[PDB]
């Protein structure tokens with residue numbers, strides 16, 4: 001695009017390369033994403049109006065010469081990078097709680113307009129120097145079906161995928177994003193991925209080994225799911241005190257509700273914001289080197 005000048009390749013999203021670039025017009029630095037059916041066009045345009053402080057802002061959509069470029073506000077780094085860097089001492093609890101609180105606000109907003117992210121993961125959570133965190137690539141999934149492999153052939157991570165998606169439910173709800181965020185919450189606290197599956201069945205079985213194999217008791221209708229197999233091994237449910245120490249009682253109570261098997265029992269983003277865990281929530285400034 002004539003109006004932009006690439007500064008550097010800052011990443012590789014699911015749909016295309018992402019560059020940090022400068023707008024020759026406004027002089028603003030931005031994140032340029034390379035990705036055209038009419039349906040995707042209408043969908044992307046809807047995204048230009050769902051603005052929230054905790055959602056990476058979609059500045060412009062350039063559909064030129066049968067190509068799609070999405071211009072997004074630029075945010076210095078992602079959460080994955082910050083997490084790896086904080087592997088030795090871990091992200092202090094006050095900051096973890098602040099990030100979770102902000103993410104829940106971003107989700108509550110999106111879910112109120114019936115938009116789901118569908119693919120939340122540390123990598124698409126962006127953080128700035130002022131203590132804020134924002135959801136990136138929000139809504140791109142419905143527009144462009146999230147594939148098994150990226151344009152670069154990298155395997156899309158299954159670690160944050162909700163069980164209903166894994167079991168074949170085709171009309172999953174906003175609850176899938178709460179599941180993902182819960183997995184991220186646990187990972188920030190323990191400094192280790194909660195369910196690092198490397199295939200759909202390994203992903204499903206890791207979930208089962210920690211939370212117990214779901215049945216009609218905890219999840220009515222589960223046995224009727226498309227990919228549910230009566231032959232799934234029967235694992236006992238582990239205790240959360242063992243899964244996410246040293247997270248306190250309120251935190252464990254909240255995480256448990258975010259990880260409920262039944263999508264209808266799983267806590268909503270809105271209800272999560274009123275949880276006592278956030279009673280003493282604050283907004284501290286992180287220690288990140290740019």
Ligand SMILES: C[C@@H]1C[C@H]2CN1CCn1[nH]c3c(cccc3c1=O)-c1nc3c(cccc3[nH]c1=O)O2
Nearest residue numbers: 011012013018031056072074075077123124136137
């Ligand atoms: C955000 C995820 C991960 C990587 C590829 N992304 C996936 C593709 N992608 N990248 C996006 C960005 C901003 C806004 C929206 C998107 C987006 O959808 C930016 N992306 C990135 C980044 C990695 C390290 C720093 C920045 N900074 C950014 O500003 O992208």
